[PDB]
Amino acid sequence: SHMIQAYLGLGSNIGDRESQLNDAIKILNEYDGISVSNISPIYETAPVGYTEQPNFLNLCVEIQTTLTVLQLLECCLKTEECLHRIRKERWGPRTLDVDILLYGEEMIDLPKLSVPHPRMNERAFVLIPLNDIAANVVEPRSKLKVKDLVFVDDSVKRYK
Ligand SMILES: Nc1nc2nc(S)n(CCO)c2c(=O)[nH]1
């Protein structure tokens, strides 16, 4: 029951993107061991990786959690599988990504999981919305607080 403060990164680029983010937050907070305590603004971001796909909506969430980072990962995975289910086949699959960004001030390096991801520092679609809710949290790989990692990126803009 020692509570860890974690940050998650959420994204959806196809379907009702905002409603997808919204549901993921709700589902995560429904776990006995997770309490959603803050949410960033939503940002519309240009796709990173494949450039030929729709824009994402991204946000980040602060949680107070008594789960271990792997149990938290489980909750993330279950939430993805759940909001991926088709609504109507002809509409196609729905989308949602939920990543653990920060878990207390710990560096976690397991074969199935790295928290923070070592390349998270590259991602404005993460850092910008992260900075709205975790500006003063130290990202342990770099040793920089999130407010000092965040950089200018015009491909990321507030959505509402
Ligand atoms: N802008 C942006 N690009 C992305 N590429 C992938 S893959 N993803 C899914 C997150 O890993 C995203 C994303 O959430 N936002």
Author numbering: -1 to 158
Kindly provide excerpts from the paper associated with this entry:
Hydroxymethyl-pterin pyrophosphokinase (HPPK) is one such enzyme, responsible for catalysing the transfer of a pyrophosphate group from the ATP to the pterin substrate, 6-hydroxymethyl-7,8-dihydropterin (HMDP). All have a thioredoxin-like fold containing the binding sites for both the substrate and the ATP cofactor. X-ray structural studies have revealed that major conformational changes, particularly in loop L3, occur throughout the catalytic cycle. The pterin stacks between two highly conserved aromatic residues (Tyr or Phe) and both the substrate and cofactor are fixed in position by a multitude of hydrogen bonds; in total, they interact with 26 separate residues.
To investigate the factors contributing to the free energy of binding, we solved the structure of SaHPPK in complex with 21a. Attempts were made to co-crystallize each of the strongest binding compounds (21a and 21c–21e) with SaHPPK, however diffraction quality crystals could only be obtained for compound 21a. These provided excellent quality electron density data, and a high-resolution X-ray structure (1.85 Å) of the SaHPPK/21a binary complex determined via molecular replacement (crystal data and details of the data collection and refinement are provided in Table 3). The ethyl alcohol pendant projects into the space leading towards the Mg2+ binding site, making two hydrogen bond contacts with a pair of bound water molecules. 7 in the SaHPPK/8-MG structure has been displaced in the SaHPPK/21a structure, and there is a tightly bound water between the hydroxyethyl and Asp97 which orients Asp97 in a similar position to that found of Asp97 of the EcHPPK/AMPCPP/HMDP structure (where Mg2+ sits). It should be noted, however, that in contrast to 8-MG, the binding of compounds 21a, 21c and 21d was found to be 10-15-fold weaker under saturating ATP conditions, suggesting extensions from ring B into the space towards the Mg2+ centres and the ATP binding site leads to competitive binding with the ATP cofactor. Titration of 21a into 15N-labelled apo (data not shown) and magnesium-loaded SaHPPK enzyme led to broadening and disappearance of several, common peaks in the 2D 15N HSQC NMR spectrum, which is characteristic of the intermediate exchange timescale, and indicates that binding of 21a is not magnesium-dependent. This is similar to what was observed for the binding of 8-MG to SaHPPK and is consistent with the fact that density characteristic of magnesium was not observed in the X-ray crystal data of the SaHPPK/21a complex. While the spectra appear to be very similar, however, closer inspection reveals that the sidechain Hε1–Nε1 peak of Trp89 (in loop L3) is only perturbed in the 8-MG bound spectrum. This is mechanistically interesting and may indicate that this region of loop L3, adjacent to the substrate-binding loop L2, is involved in binding of 8-MG but not 21a.
